[PDB]
Design a protein around this motif. Sequence first.
Motif, PDB file in Angstrom:
ATOM      1  N   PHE A  79      37.347  -3.338  12.513  1.00  0.00           N
ATOM      2  CA  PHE A  79      36.020  -3.505  13.090  1.00  0.00           C
ATOM      3  C   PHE A  79      35.791  -2.657  14.329  1.00  0.00           C
ATOM      4  O   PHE A  79      36.595  -2.741  15.247  1.00  0.00           O
ATOM      5  CB  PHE A  79      35.833  -4.979  13.464  1.00  0.00           C
ATOM      6  N   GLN A  80      34.713  -1.915  14.367  1.00  0.00           N
ATOM      7  CA  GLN A  80      34.350  -1.092  15.499  1.00  0.00           C
ATOM      8  C   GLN A  80      33.706  -1.849  16.656  1.00  0.00           C
ATOM      9  O   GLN A  80      33.520  -3.078  16.689  1.00  0.00           O
ATOM     10  CB  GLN A  80      33.403  -0.027  14.962  1.00  0.00           C
ATOM     11  N   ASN A  81      33.366  -1.072  17.698  1.00  0.00           N
ATOM     12  CA  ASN A  81      32.775  -1.558  18.914  1.00  0.00           C
ATOM     13  C   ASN A  81      31.343  -2.085  18.752  1.00  0.00           C
ATOM     14  O   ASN A  81      30.498  -1.450  18.117  1.00  0.00           O
ATOM     15  CB  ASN A  81      32.672  -0.465  19.989  1.00  0.00           C
ATOM     16  N   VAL A  82      31.144  -3.223  19.388  1.00  0.00           N
ATOM     17  CA  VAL A  82      29.861  -3.887  19.450  1.00  0.00           C
ATOM     18  C   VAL A  82      28.908  -3.024  20.273  1.00  0.00           C
ATOM     19  O   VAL A  82      29.325  -2.604  21.389  1.00  0.00           O
ATOM     20  CB  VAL A  82      30.094  -5.158  20.319  1.00  0.00           C
ATOM     21  N   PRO A 141      30.087 -10.895  21.823  1.00  0.00           N
ATOM     22  CA  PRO A 141      30.775  -9.740  21.254  1.00  0.00           C
ATOM     23  C   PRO A 141      32.240 -10.083  21.076  1.00  0.00           C
ATOM     24  O   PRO A 141      32.766 -10.849  21.894  1.00  0.00           O
ATOM     25  CB  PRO A 141      30.448  -8.596  22.160  1.00  0.00           C
ATOM     26  N   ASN A 142      32.854  -9.603  19.976  1.00  0.00           N
ATOM     27  CA  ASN A 142      34.265  -9.947  19.748  1.00  0.00           C
ATOM     28  C   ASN A 142      35.081  -8.654  19.658  1.00  0.00           C
ATOM     29  O   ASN A 142      36.248  -8.570  19.274  1.00  0.00           O
ATOM     30  CB  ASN A 142      34.475 -10.780  18.498  1.00  0.00           C
ATOM     31  N   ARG A 143      34.376  -7.587  19.994  1.00  0.00           N
ATOM     32  CA  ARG A 143      34.930  -6.253  20.029  1.00  0.00           C
ATOM     33  C   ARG A 143      34.540  -5.636  21.372  1.00  0.00           C
ATOM     34  O   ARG A 143      33.841  -6.250  22.209  1.00  0.00           O
ATOM     35  CB  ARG A 143      34.402  -5.506  18.833  1.00  0.00           C
ATOM     36  N   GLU A 144      35.006  -4.422  21.659  1.00  0.00           N
ATOM     37  CA  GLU A 144      34.622  -3.861  22.945  1.00  0.00           C
ATOM     38  C   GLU A 144      33.186  -3.383  22.930  1.00  0.00           C
ATOM     39  O   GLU A 144      32.671  -2.937  21.905  1.00  0.00           O
ATOM     40  CB  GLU A 144      35.607  -2.763  23.362  1.00  0.00           C
ATOM     41  N   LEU A 145      32.588  -3.512  24.134  1.00  0.00           N
ATOM     42  CA  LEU A 145      31.207  -3.036  24.225  1.00  0.00           C
ATOM     43  C   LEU A 145      31.198  -1.525  24.233  1.00  0.00           C
ATOM     44  O   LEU A 145      32.150  -0.973  24.771  1.00  0.00           O
ATOM     45  CB  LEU A 145      30.621  -3.546  25.560  1.00  0.00           C
ATOM     46  N   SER A 146      30.189  -0.868  23.708  1.00  0.00           N
ATOM     47  CA  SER A 146      30.160   0.572  23.867  1.00  0.00           C
ATOM     48  C   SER A 146      28.870   1.172  23.344  1.00  0.00           C
ATOM     49  O   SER A 146      28.401   0.735  22.274  1.00  0.00           O
ATOM     50  CB  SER A 146      31.325   1.256  23.168  1.00  0.00           C
ATOM     51  N   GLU A 147      28.363   2.247  23.948  1.00  0.00           N
ATOM     52  CA  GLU A 147      27.155   2.844  23.356  1.00  0.00           C
ATOM     53  C   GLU A 147      27.556   3.478  22.036  1.00  0.00           C
ATOM     54  O   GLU A 147      26.716   3.800  21.178  1.00  0.00           O
ATOM     55  CB  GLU A 147      26.505   3.817  24.316  1.00  0.00           C
ATOM     56  N   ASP A 148      28.847   3.717  21.803  1.00  0.00           N
ATOM     57  CA  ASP A 148      29.279   4.294  20.535  1.00  0.00           C
ATOM     58  C   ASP A 148      29.641   3.134  19.582  1.00  0.00           C
ATOM     59  O   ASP A 148      30.803   2.691  19.625  1.00  0.00           O
ATOM     60  CB  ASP A 148      30.456   5.223  20.719  1.00  0.00           C
ATOM     61  N   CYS A 149      28.615   2.703  18.820  1.00  0.00           N
ATOM     62  CA  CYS A 149      28.703   1.532  17.973  1.00  0.00           C
ATOM     63  C   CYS A 149      28.005   1.591  16.639  1.00  0.00           C
ATOM     64  O   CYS A 149      27.994   0.581  15.913  1.00  0.00           O
ATOM     65  CB  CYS A 149      28.041   0.331  18.747  1.00  0.00           C
ATOM     66  N   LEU A 150      27.417   2.716  16.275  1.00  0.00           N
ATOM     67  CA  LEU A 150      26.735   2.864  15.003  1.00  0.00           C
ATOM     68  C   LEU A 150      27.633   3.012  13.811  1.00  0.00           C
ATOM     69  O   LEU A 150      27.850   4.100  13.246  1.00  0.00           O
ATOM     70  CB  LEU A 150      25.749   4.062  15.066  1.00  0.00           C
ATOM     71  N   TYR A 151      28.231   1.908  13.382  1.00  0.00           N
ATOM     72  CA  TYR A 151      29.106   1.835  12.231  1.00  0.00           C
ATOM     73  C   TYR A 151      28.599   0.731  11.315  1.00  0.00           C
ATOM     74  O   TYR A 151      27.722  -0.016  11.773  1.00  0.00           O
ATOM     75  CB  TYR A 151      30.528   1.466  12.704  1.00  0.00           C
TER      76      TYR A 151
END
Lengths: 539, 539
Positions: free
Chosen positions: A61-64, A84-94
């Motif tokens: 699972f990718q970043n929220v 969120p159960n993943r790291e926050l990030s502007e890079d999240c389009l998955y």
Amino acid sequence: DPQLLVRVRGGQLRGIRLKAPGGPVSAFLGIPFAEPPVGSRRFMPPEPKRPWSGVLDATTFQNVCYQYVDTLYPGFEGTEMWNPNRELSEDCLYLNVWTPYPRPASPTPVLIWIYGGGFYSGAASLDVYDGRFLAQVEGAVLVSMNYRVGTFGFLALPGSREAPGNVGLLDQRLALQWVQENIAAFGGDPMSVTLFGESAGAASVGMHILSLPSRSLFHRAVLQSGTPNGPWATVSAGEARRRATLLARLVGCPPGGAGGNDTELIACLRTRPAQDLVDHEWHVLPQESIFRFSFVPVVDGDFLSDTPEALINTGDFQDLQVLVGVVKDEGSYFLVYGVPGFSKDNESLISRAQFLAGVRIGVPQASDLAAEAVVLHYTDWLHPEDPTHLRDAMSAVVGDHNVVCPVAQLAGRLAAQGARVYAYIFEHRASTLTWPLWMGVPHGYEIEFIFGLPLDPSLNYTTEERIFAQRLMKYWTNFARTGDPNDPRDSKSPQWPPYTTAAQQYVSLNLKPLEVRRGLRAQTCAFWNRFLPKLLSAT
Amino acid sequence: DPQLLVRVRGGQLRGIRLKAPGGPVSAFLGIPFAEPPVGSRRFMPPEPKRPWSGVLDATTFQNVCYQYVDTLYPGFEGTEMWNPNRELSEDCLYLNVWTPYPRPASPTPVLIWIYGGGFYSGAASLDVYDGRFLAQVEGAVLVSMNYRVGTFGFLALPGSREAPGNVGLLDQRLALQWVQENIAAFGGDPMSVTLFGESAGAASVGMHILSLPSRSLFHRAVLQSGTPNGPWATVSAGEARRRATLLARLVGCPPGGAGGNDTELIACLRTRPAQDLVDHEWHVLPQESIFRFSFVPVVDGDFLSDTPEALINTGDFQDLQVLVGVVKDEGSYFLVYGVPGFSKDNESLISRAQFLAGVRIGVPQASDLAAEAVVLHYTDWLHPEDPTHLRDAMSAVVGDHNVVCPVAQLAGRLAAQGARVYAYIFEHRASTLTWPLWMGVPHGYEIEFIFGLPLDPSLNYTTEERIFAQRLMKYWTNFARTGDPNDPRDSKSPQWPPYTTAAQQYVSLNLKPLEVRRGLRAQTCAFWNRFLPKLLSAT
């Protein structure tokens, strides 16, 4: 294992083999669907992920996306489970894909899920959106993507080139075009795309139906607890602007007594640390309130050609199959977040004066007279001070105003325009529910069931809940394949009739078998959908 | 026979011996209570009848006051039964007395009845107001007077010496002062005077309670289907004037472009044939309407010191015993008189548009928004065109607006101020009723029962109706003697509890035994008594 190895239109991927109670599942977590919308890309429409070399790992699972995180009740499952159960990030389009192991035989129907969280929060990474059971058990190809929420998703300066709005929706549309041109390879049928989401995801699904370009990418639609047409899922251009610049200004964008350059404004905004924006997110609302969000879809006259109201009012939905529904107590959850007298820790037996105030927070746009109207309507004049009644009343004002009546306004408008609509009322309170009894079945507590979480034995629901779940999954996947939640050809006892203008039929989704009913809060919703508005437009 | 010969404070009288089913009754019909208010007396407060020589004959019913006569359904019992049954005449200030034969032993309680007919029609001479049964059977001394209705009773030019208004009420007050100083001689107790009337008579009884000087002349009060506080039983000075002069003008008073002399105006009016006035009676209403009357009590700041609303709102009624009630369908009767689509001859299954119009006739004072509010409230949004529903809805708007909610507003205001109140809902449709089934239990169809008409075998009701009647008579006379409609000490099964702010108890007056209920149209009346007014005062 070729099961876990798939070539996509832009490269190779390696899934992971998950174990659901009834068997194995293929799972392709983390598929880039677009170029990270970072840096000079912030606030911009998404762009198609470039093709990659080698084998893209997709076993996790990718970043929220970047978003506010709920404090309020720290360590409390009821709120945390949404966080969120993943790291926050502007890079999240998955996005994610679950397919039964092994890949289906023939083109299975696909269920694309759209998470909801006021348009300001949310993530496919969440536990309750675990598509393994629906693939495992109902043999469905399930997909759940991440879309930019908050300022990043919706901050807009209408008319601008660089922050034009609704980009979080374009994110979802992009995930949709990807499912189109690649779900095939996972054994999914690009010809039977059924969108389905809750809260603002439902609202979103709604916007896809209302948006031309989203049309060709899906065929059926489900909208749980949320619609594109109510009081909170869209704002006008003017307000959008008003909250963009105000937010900018609080963040020092632009610095000094500068101005009149939207570009400089966005340029400036584009340099602030993500959290700086999230920090002022909640300061641009125009009144004290609940069930109102700062950054959400804007009526630009592009993605939405006109308001959702006008659209569901004159759109041609003559063929669309749509399942729609609501839970027992939509409004409850929201009361804890801002209505004096309510808490998850006591029975929240409020005073009358509290209830009078609640009404103004809960219906912030209401003038006095309109507020009066609402109080008239929800007060029980034989006991205008019974705290218990007041309490439940508050929850109804909120739940009816934002979710129920809007659902009903959409159901009917759809049906009247051609749609084949089905409706329901989730009434089963999970045994596991950690919120107080007084909230009954809160906004969002049907998800655990539709997704099939009770099928997991560790999780420990009740066998009924389990069976229940299976039933629910069955309705969804059935509406998904056929466009009728009903037992195949197999006319297995209780039937679910289409919601109709004239009969107004909907069903009780709960432990006891289907139980058709007529009129979704018919009076109450006449109040809200027919009269209240003219009151407001007079005042 | 000394039974039929009585000396009154102003002379001798000869009654007549009537035969009721259970025995003989003394009856003194036609007692002058005042000097005929004719000639230069028209529009003037009444004056005490001068004492007469010899033996005044009182063996018969006198002339009905001057009044409009109902055409509409000529020869139809339902309307005719309300019409004058004696000759019309401005010389009509007489009263009646029924006493059991032979005169009671000790001071029996007296029941003074006040007929009702919109303040524009009516007469004690009527068949359904036959006080023989209640005297015969319950051994009560019953009195029913005539009071000037229409222009003669209420035409007023507030502030004027010669047409000051409310003289029809002063007529009743005068009859009251007479009962005071003379009922004694008929075996009545001047100490247990219980006023009781229907429609505007009820409204009247209400005004006596609201008027100081009427206070000392009665001790208990009953108000059937009518109150002093609604939308139709009083007008302001300004409107009074507006309808006086307008009426005058249509009658040629004053002739030419004359003016500014109220005296000349009244002088002029005082010369027109009675029927000339009745001819223009109905042309001074300000809008098309129903359950609205041209000449009725005016808030002069004399007989009523302020509006009945303000009065029941701050009056001290801390001791007053008051019985109050209403029938199943107040509004029905009035629909035939002016609401397109209704007739006594068909089922009056109206259209929606008809119903929309009805609402404006039935609530003439309503602005558009307020009308909208009413439509919202009475429309059934699951079937907004069902004619049957619409039909009954119309009847409810009218009945709730004019009779029920006002009753409830008074009940509660009274109780809250000290009164001991009792309430009821007459629900038995007489078998004999000549109106169509659709009107169910129309305004005024309880009278036959309270008066005890079913006890007459010729009349032919059902034995149940008979028994019923007896029961009803029992409640009245009991409230009359005690101030509690309840079986003496004899706690004979079902009890009638006082209407209270908190519990809001009232009883079903019908064939099946008492059946206590709570809240008289509670929501609906909250609509009308609490919200609607603010809507109207905003618009």
